[PDB]
Curated annotation (Swiss-Prot), chain A:
Protein's UniProt name: Ankyrin-1
Record PTM text: Regulated by phosphorylation.
Domain notes: The 55 kDa regulatory domain is involved in regulating binding of SPTB/spectrin (beta chain) and SLC4A1/erythrocyte membrane protein band 3.
Disease field: Spherocytosis 1: A form of spherocytosis, a hematologic disorder leading to chronic hemolytic anemia and characterized by numerous abnormally shaped erythrocytes which are generally spheroidal. SPH1 is characterized by severe hemolytic anemia. Inheritance can be autosomal dominant or autosomal recessive. Patients with homozygous mutations have a more severe disorder.
Shown residues in whole-protein numbering: 11 to 171 of 1881
Annotated function: Component of the ankyrin-1 complex, a multiprotein complex involved in the stability and shape of the erythrocyte membrane. Attaches integral membrane proteins to cytoskeletal elements; binds to the erythrocyte membrane protein band 4.2, to Na-K ATPase, to the lymphocyte membrane protein GP85, and to the cytoskeletal proteins fodrin, tubulin, vimentin and desmin. Erythrocyte ankyrins also link spectrin (beta chain) to the cytoplasmic domain of the erythrocytes anion exchange protein; they retain most or all of these binding functions.
Chain positions of ANK repeats: 34-63, 67-96, 100-129, 133-161
Superkingdom in the source lineage: Eukaryota
Curated annotation (Swiss-Prot), chain B:
Glycosylation sites: N334
Keyword Nucleotide-binding tagged: no
Transmembrane segments: 3-23, 31-51, 59-79, 93-113, 122-142, 147-167, 188-208, 219-239, 248-270, 275-297, 312-332, 342-362
Protein name (record): Ammonium transporter Rh type A
Extracellular compartment spans: 80-92, 143-146, 209-218, 271-274, 333-341
Post-translational modification: Glycosylated.
Subcellular location: Membrane
Molecular function terms, GO-annotated: ammonium channel activity; ankyrin binding; carbon dioxide transmembrane transporter activity; leak channel activity; methylammonium transmembrane transporter activity
Self-association state and partner proteins as the record states: Homodimer. Heterotrimer; a RHCE monomer interacts with a RHAG homodimer. Component of the ankyrin-1 complex in the erythrocyte, composed of ANK1, RHCE, RHAG, SLC4A1, EPB42, GYPA, GYPB and AQP1. Interacts with GYPB (via the N-terminal); this interaction bridges the (RHAG)2(RHCE) heterotrimer with the SLC4A1 Band 3 I dimer complexed with GYPA.
Reaction equation(s) it catalyzes: methylamine(out) = methylamine(in); NH4(+)(in) = NH4(+)(out); CO2(out) = CO2(in)
Tissues showing expression: Erythrocytes.
From Swiss-Prot, chain D:
GO cellular component terms, semicolon-separated: ankyrin-1 complex; plasma membrane
Top-level taxon in the UniProt lineage: Eukaryota
Gene Ontology biological process terms, A to Z: ammonium homeostasis; ammonium transmembrane transport
Protein name according to UniProt: Blood group Rh(CE) polypeptide
Result for mutant: M219V: Found in antigen RhEFM
Encoding gene per record: RHCE
Annotated SUPFAM superfamilies: Ammonium transporter
Outcome of swapping Q35R: Found in antigen C(W)/Rh8
Source organism of this protein record: Homo sapiens (Human)
From Swiss-Prot, chain E:
Tissue-specificity statement: Erythrocytes.
Disulfide bonding pattern of the chain: none
Classification lineage: Eukaryota, Metazoa, Chordata, Craniata, Vertebrata
Segments on the Cytoplasmic face: 1-2, 54-60, 116-123, 170-189, 242-249, 300-313, 365-390
Reactions performed catalytically: methylamine(out) = methylamine(in); NH4(+)(in) = NH4(+)(out); CO2(out) = CO2(in)
Subunit structure: Homodimer. Heterotrimer; a RHCE monomer interacts with a RHAG homodimer. Component of the ankyrin-1 complex in the erythrocyte, composed of ANK1, RHCE, RHAG, SLC4A1, EPB42, GYPA, GYPB and AQP1. Interacts with GYPB (via the N-terminal); this interaction bridges the (RHAG)2(RHCE) heterotrimer with the SLC4A1 Band 3 I dimer complexed with GYPA.
UniProt topological domain (Extracellular) ranges: 82-94, 145-148, 211-220, 273-276, 335-343
The protein's name in its UniProt record: Ammonium transporter Rh type A
GO BP of this protein: ammonium homeostasis; ammonium transmembrane transport; bicarbonate transport; carbon dioxide transmembrane transport; carbon dioxide transport; erythrocyte development; inorganic cation transmembrane transport; intracellular monoatomic ion homeostasis
Length: 161, 388, 33, 380, 390
């Protein structure tokens, strides 16, 4: 009940209720049946203040879900530019790979999130990391028609971090 | 040999000319014929163009197979109806020849991407012989009502193609193939065939219907069956897919299952509510077949079906036959129970046996069959442009 | 009787194709060696 | 919020299956079935079906990455709309007897929704389109019933207002949506759809006409009016384009100009030259609309609205030759516009509800929102 | 210059309206489905058949629509004036079908010069060619009294040789060894297959629309049906025969499969038997494929006649084969009318097509219609806004 209420508050962005559960003793690393903790749920919904507050209370930043997605993966797939920036500012691994081999750059590129793609490239995301299918962020954006993303990935090339 | 295909095409055409000279002599149904014509050549052919590197072969071999098929089916069906005597050609002969072409195209959908055009000519000849004999048996010996041909065309074509594809099994293709994949514009082109089949199916089920009440019911029942089938196929595609995304394979094919499953009961007094029930069940069954039975057939039973014709033509055709039996049970038709059941069983069994023999003939390495790596590729038989 | 005629036509076509292919294969096996 | 689309794996199937089950139950409880020209009568409804599924289905497929959704959602909308229109035209014009004429009229009612949906396609999901289909068919039937009660005309003959009703309904619904492109192969497929609409539009202008000479003259006028419009469109596209080139997108909408212009008055025009004059004037107004309307969301639906208004106006002008009837017909037109606007507003506020899980404004005009594509990360 | 195309079109349309007002007044529903099929053949079949060019699909289908929309009006006017001898006439379904036939002739001619002309040039070609075609078809039907119900000579041979004459006059030296934009693409070829299939399916309506109801119309439908069926087989066989390594050629499959429908036209309503129709279709497909492989390369390089769609191999040679087939059929006794009158129709059709095409091409050769450069040939961007994405 307490952990479920905390996760619901994290998903809804109710920072005050979530801060109360942690005072009362709800472990910050609790996750739902899908392996998503409070940081994942806040990153999905763009709740930057909740993300910052949870990072301050020592949540594990590189905790993966049952699909192997980190909080940066979820923020990139959801296109939350400010949450992506905040996660990277606190030391999120931009080159993390999920179970199927997806990187945050791949999730941002397949979803036509140009700002997230540009930010992840400027932070040293290696666009040569392929999935288990052999697909790159460039290859998925070509298939999905994401031309603004295809341009930025080719024009950046390897400016690195 | 590169000369096997032109030799067989020329020899078959000369045989067709001679048979027409030996057996053949010389307007309210012409628009319905043209609707069926569009279904045969635009519908199936562009429906099969979903493969990214097999569109040329899909549409062109569709045209070639159906063009040979209408002539050969004309000859065989006319000989059967005339008991070896000379016969005249009307609009009904052309419609029935197009129906024989439809059966062969349904079987082609099972072996698409793994067979040569020469194999397709051979399969056309043999399959039309078997189909015409079974259809004569159903229409004249059993005297069963199959005006939309859920049994004689759709179930027959599907299980004939499945038997052929089972005989022509390749071990290297059981796990998949890199060419066996759709493209974006390829699925856009497949939507053309889907839409034309959906639009013109009421004429398919009512072309040779008895004029009057039966022909009107065939049109109305087919229309509402397809209307219900579209909604149920859309609903079940989302339900079997992650996050409820639609699959173009389902919306291209399962949206047409209502036309197949209403064929036996098209002309019968099943009512527009009953036709919609049949269409909804057909759409659900077709979607479930694509998502769960096609992998089971490919991996376990070693039966690879390229276009999923078992889910559009086989299972809905069987459902249509069972619907005909049930409609006979509740007085919707004056035809016998046992004759509808015998028509279903004879169609399926004749399809399987003829497909076995035809596939055994097609397995001889004389027809230029593609290699495992070269399956689902136009370049084996076509000159392909450099750009898409 | 119509079945007999159809089987006869199939037999004629199959015999023609088989004889032509047999002649071609025999010529090929005599010529390559 | 999360730009990644919310899962509709429980919303869309339940919604569609419930709709189909309700339609089946209503057809059971209220509909009943029951000669020489059976095929001839079937041909008109078949032409309308081709123009709905293929014509309007592919006409809006010109989007670089929404062609799948355009075609398939148009098919779904037609399938739902014909059934619901059968039931509703049964309820508001009387048990419901299913004839080929009633199916033809239901197809026309569904085509109204299909025309309206072009203003909102690319910005809505399937559930919102279901709501739009239901409410728009209901609004059109209510409008026809109100006209039949007030002006004492036949309920079926009131379906002549469908061009202007569809145009203004679509404009209002698109105006209520949250605020936010072409490719060659989708443009060619859209040309296919536009060509089928243009070749069969003489069937749109005479499904409701019984007298054979009236249908003859209507098809004649529509055919010649459409012929002049194509020439005015392809020829005047260059003038109404900044780079002085012909626009495929403009042509796709403007070919139908003469057909829309003479739609309500085709059976009344006595000579082909007058139909050709109206087609030329419609083409010129289409050019002017293309050149002016973007200055003052979809430009093609705006010019279609202008063309429908012009068609009603020229009906008013021609009906006098063949002043109380002027006032009555102006009143009918204004009632049609008012009801279209109000029902479009109601539909727009209904579509804005959070429960429909509408695509994010950043995700408009994109098939990946609704369809399965390979090599994509799925879920969280 | 900048306004030549819209001004010419608006003047032509105003002229059409004035002529219709001066001369045109208002069995129909029985022949209407056949007219609908012919209309689909005109606007979808011919239009999408020529969309095989990778950078010319927009111009192909759109200029096909402009020419046919203009052609139906102008052909109605010209054919009605010729039939009524300058009197006011009433239009029926026959008038629409004949106008679409005239548009078909103009589109056949357009297939020869596709990618090398401007829309203004095609307006002028439509206007002049409809006059020439209608005068010849009146000579062949009313003075020679020949039987050409499927119009192998009056539409196909005439249109093909008219287009060949225009292409010869409009010859470009810098296009004899080819052009980068003259090439097909995969999806362009699929669109071309759309056009091919619609033409192939609806050709029986094309050949039976004007036929006498009863035995003649049914004979035309059956003959066209089986001739096209045989033509497909022979086109596929000879496409496999003539190409390298036996690969099929999409040009042959797109075009040579309609040669049977072209060639059976004169003999369509005659009692040649279905088997005779199949023999004509089998030869028509063979001749069309052989023309595409051998005749077109010679015509382009040795004769300086570049024909983009190969309309000589589909309409020209099979049209002459059909006229000759009609002459043999009268000799066999299949038809009424004389041998000499059928021969007169074939000679008149080519001679008129060549003379009218020469004068029309001389008019089109004037540097006033904004015709493209050798570099911009086969490119939509000269006249259309082309999307960046394919």
């Amino acid at each position: 009940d307490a952990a479920t209420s905390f996760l619901r508050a994290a998903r809804s962005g109710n920072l005050d209720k979530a801060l109360d559960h942690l005072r009362n003793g709800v472990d910050i690393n609790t996750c739902n049946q899908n392996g998503l903790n409070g940081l994942h749920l806040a990153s999905k919904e763009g709740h930057v203040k909740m993300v910052v507050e949870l990072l301050h209370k020592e949540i594990i930043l590189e905790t993966t879900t049952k699909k192997g997605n980190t909080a940066l993966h979820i923020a990139a797939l959801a296109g939350q530019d400010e949450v992506v920036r905040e996660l990277v500012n606190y030391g999120a691994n931009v080159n993390a790979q999920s179970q199927k081999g997806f990187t945050p750059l791949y999730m941002a590129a397949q979803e036509n999130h140009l700002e997230v793609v540009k930010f992840l490239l400027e932070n040293g995301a290696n666009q040569n990391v392929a999935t288990e299918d052999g697909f790159t962020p460039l290859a998925v954006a070509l298939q999905q028609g994401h031309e603004n993303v295809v341009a930025h990935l080719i024009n950046y090339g390897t400016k690195g971090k | 040999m590169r000369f096997t295909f032109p030799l067989m095409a020329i020899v078959l055409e000369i045989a067709m000319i001679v048979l027409f000279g030996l057996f053949v002599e010389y307007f309210e149904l012409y628009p319905l014929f043209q609707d069926v014509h569009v279904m045969i050549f635009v519908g199936f052919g562009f429906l099969m163009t979903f493969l990214k590197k097999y569109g040329f072969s899909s549409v062109g071999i569709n045209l070639l197979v159906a063009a040979l098929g209408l002539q050969w089916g004309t000859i065989v069906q006319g000989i059967l109806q005339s008991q070896g005597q000379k016969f005249n050609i009307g609009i009904k002969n052309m419609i029935n020849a197009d129906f024989s072409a439809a059966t062969v195209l349904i079987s082609f959908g099972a072996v698409l991407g793994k067979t040569s055009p020469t194999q397709m000519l051979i399969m056309t000849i043999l399959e039309i012989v078997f189909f015409a004999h079974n259809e004569y048996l159903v229409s004249e010996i059993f005297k069963a009502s199959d005006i939309g041909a859920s049994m004689t065309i759709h179930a027959f074509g599907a299980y004939f193609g499945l038997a052929v594809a089972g005989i022509l099994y390749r071990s290297g293709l059981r796990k998949g193939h890199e060419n066996e994949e759709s493209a974006y514009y390829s699925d856009l082109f497949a939507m053309i065939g889907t839409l034309f089949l959906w639009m013109f199916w009421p004429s398919f089920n009512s072309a040779i219907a008895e004029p009057g009440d039966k022909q009107c019911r065939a049109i109305v029942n087919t229309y509402f069956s397809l209307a219900a089938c579209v909604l149920t196929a859309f609903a079940f595609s989302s339900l079997v897919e992650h996050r409820g995304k639609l699959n173009m394979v389902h919306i291209q094919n399962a949206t047409l299952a209502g036309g197949v499953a209403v064929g036996t009961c098209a002309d019968m007094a099943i009512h527009p509510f009953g036709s919609m029930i049949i269409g909804s069940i057909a759409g659900m069954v077709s979607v479930l077949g694509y998502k769960f039975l096609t992998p089971l057939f490919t991996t376990k039973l070693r039966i690879h079906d390229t276009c999923g014709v078992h889910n559009l033509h086989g299972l809905p055709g069987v459902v249509g036959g069972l619907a005909g039996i049930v409609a006979v049970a509740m007085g919707a038709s004056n035809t016998s129970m046992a004759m509808q059941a015998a028509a279903l069983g004879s169609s399926i069994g004749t399809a399987v046996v003829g497909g076995l023999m035809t596939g055994l003939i097609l397995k001889l390495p004389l027809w230029g069959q593609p290699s495992d790596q070269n399956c689902y590729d136009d370049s084996v038989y076509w000159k392909v442009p450099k750009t898409r | 009787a119509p079945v007999v005629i159809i089987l006869i036509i199939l037999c004629v076509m199959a015999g023609i194709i088989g004889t032509i292919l047999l002649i071609s294969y025999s010529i090929r096996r005599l010529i390559k060696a | 919020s999360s730009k990644y689309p919310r899962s509709v794996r429980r919303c869309l199937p339940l919604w569609a299956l419930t709709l189909e089950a309700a339609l089946i139950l209503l057809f059971y409880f209220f509909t009943h079935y029951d000669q020489k020209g059976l095929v001839a009568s079937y041909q008109v409804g078949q032409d309308l079906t081709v123009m709905a599924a293929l014509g309007l289905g592919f006409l809006t497929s010109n989007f670089r990455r929404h062609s799948w959704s355009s075609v398939a959602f148009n098919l779904f909308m037609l399938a739902l709309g014909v059934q619901w229109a059968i039931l509703l035209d049964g309820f508001l014009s009387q048990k419901v007897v299913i004839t080929l004429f009633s199916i033809r009229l239901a197809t026309m009612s569904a085509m109204s929704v299909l025309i309206s949906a072009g203003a909102v396609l690319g910005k809505v999901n399937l559930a919102q389109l279901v709501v739009m289909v239901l409410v728009e068919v209901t609004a059109l039937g209510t409008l026809r019933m109100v006209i039949s009660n007030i002006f004492n005309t036949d309920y079926h003959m009131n379906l002549r207002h469908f061009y202007v009703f569809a145009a203004y309904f679509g404009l209002t619904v698109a105006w209520c949506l949250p605020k936010p492109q072409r490719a060659t192969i989708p443009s060619l497929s859209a040309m296919l759809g536009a060509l089928f609409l243009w070749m069969f539009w003489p069937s749109v202008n005479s499904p409701l006409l019984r007298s054979p000479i009236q249908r003859k003259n209507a098809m004649f006028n529509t055919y010649y009016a459409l012929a002049v419009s194509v020439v005015t469109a392809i020829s005047g596209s260059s003038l109404a384009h900044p780079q002085r080139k012909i626009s495929m997108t403009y042509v796709h909408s403007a070919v139908l100009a003469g057909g829309v212009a003479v739609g309500t008055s085709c059976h009344l025009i006595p000579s082909p030259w007058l139909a050709m004059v109206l087609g030329l004037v419609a083409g010129l107004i289409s050019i002017g609309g293309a050149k002016c309307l973007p200055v003052c969301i979809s430009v093609m639906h705006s010019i279609f609205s202008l063309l429908g208004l012009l068609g009603e106006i020229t009906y008013i002008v021609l009906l006098v030759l063949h002043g109380f009837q002027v006032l009555l017909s102006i009143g009918e037109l204004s009632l049609a516009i008012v009801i279209a606007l109000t029902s479009g507003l109601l539909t727009g506020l209904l579509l804005n509800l959070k429960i429909w899980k509408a695509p994010h404004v950043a995700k408009y005009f994109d098939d990946q929102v609704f369809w399965k594509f390979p090599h994509l990360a799925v879920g969280f």
